[PDB]
């Protein structure tokens, strides 16, 4: 079984890679993009207005080998805002990344 410490270490590496991406990725094509962010779970890039944004299941997951084709989703509204839950948190679908 994968230990808590092993998962914590890989999560820290994932967070560090995310912060490199947030700093290094080129600016969006326009200001109407939803803005990149790290929500403690997934690393989100800039979002195209009016489109779903898909990110691979975070590779630090203990069961990541069981969901290799899965994606976590956000929705970027036409006004450049991440879709919000009715909670003031962004809408998120993690179903493809849940443990089998």
């Amino acid at each position: 079984t994968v230990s808590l410490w092993e998962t914590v270490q890989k999560w820290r590496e994932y967070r560090r890679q995310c912060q490199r991406s947030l700093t290094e990725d080129p600016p969006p094509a326009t200001d109407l993009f939803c803005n990149r962010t790290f929500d403690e779970y997934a690393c989100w890039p800039d979002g195209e207005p009016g489109s779903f944004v898909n990110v691979s299941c975070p590779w630090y997951l203990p069961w990541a080998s069981s969901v290799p084709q899965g994606h976590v989703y956000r929705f970027c509204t036409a006004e450049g805002l991440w879709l919000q839950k009715d909670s003031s948190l962004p809408w998120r679908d993690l179903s493809e990344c849940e443990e089998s």
Binding site: T1, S3, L4, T7, W11, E40, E99
Partner: peptide, 27 residues
């Protein structure tokens, strides 16, 4: 199957990592 003490102790150890993920997700 799943009838031995090591099965339960291993289950416990794996729950620590899983609760960490749930903590990341829910907040």
């Amino acid at each position: 199957e799943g009838x031995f003490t090591s099965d339960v102790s291993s289950y416990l150890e794996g729950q620590a990592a899983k609760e960490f993920i749930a903590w990341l997700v829910k907040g």
